[PDB]
């Protein structure tokens, strides 16, 4: 699943950078240029989204009450329930990923770094399984890079 593979590379690298500050030096494989451009886009748009939505993000994080792996595993059902309905737009997708980065920072703060990769996998899974049709129409990560280009 090329779209899952590419989406996971971008989302897991962003969530790891945000939580730990470390940069992945490993090559990204197929559609690497677009993946690197999408990750660069997330660094700029994602930082500002977390600052802009800080109050609601703090509130949503507190209600989810994530403290371990078992709490992370139960997030997939929550994301599927909220993200499946309503109109999709790039704003909604970047804010889903930016909230994932906000939760990843919380996971590092509580010394649960081992939960960051399962969280990135769970976000990617919900994005691709619920929005593949819309992502095909919008040209996937090429569409994402173009939409937020400045
Ligand atoms: O786009 C929507 O339909 C939307 C719906 C709501 S109604 C309340 C649902 C809720 C969520 C969390 C805790 C409690 C309740 C609130 C905000 C919304 N937009 S969003 O762009 O900010 N957003 C951020 C939160 N994503 C879910 C998520 C959960 C864990 C995670 F690691 C990453 C993402 C959904 C998309």
UniProtKB/Swiss-Prot annotation:
A motif (BH1) lies at residues 81-101. Keywords: Apoptosis, Cytoplasm, Developmental protein, Differentiation, Isopeptide bond, Membrane, Mitochondrion, Nucleus, Phosphoprotein, Transmembrane, Transmembrane helix, Ubl conjugation. One of its GO terms (biological process) is cellular homeostasis. Cleaved by CASP3 during apoptosis. Induction: Expression increases early during phorbol ester-induced differentiation along the monocyte/macrophage pathway in myeloid leukemia cell line ML-1. Rapidly up-regulated by CSF2 in ML-1 cells. Up-regulated by heat shock-induced differentiation. Expression increases early during retinoic acid-induced differentiation. Disulfide bonds: none annotated. One of its GO terms (cellular component) is Bcl-2 family protein complex. A motif (BH3) lies at residues 38-52. Involved in the regulation of apoptosis versus cell survival, and in the maintenance of viability but not of proliferation. Mediates its effects by interactions with a number of other regulators of apoptosis. Isoform 1 inhibits apoptosis. Isoform 2 promotes apoptosis. This is Induced myeloid leukemia cell differentiation protein Mcl-1. It comes from Homo sapiens. The gene is MCL1. The chain holds residues 172 to 321 of 350 of the full protein.
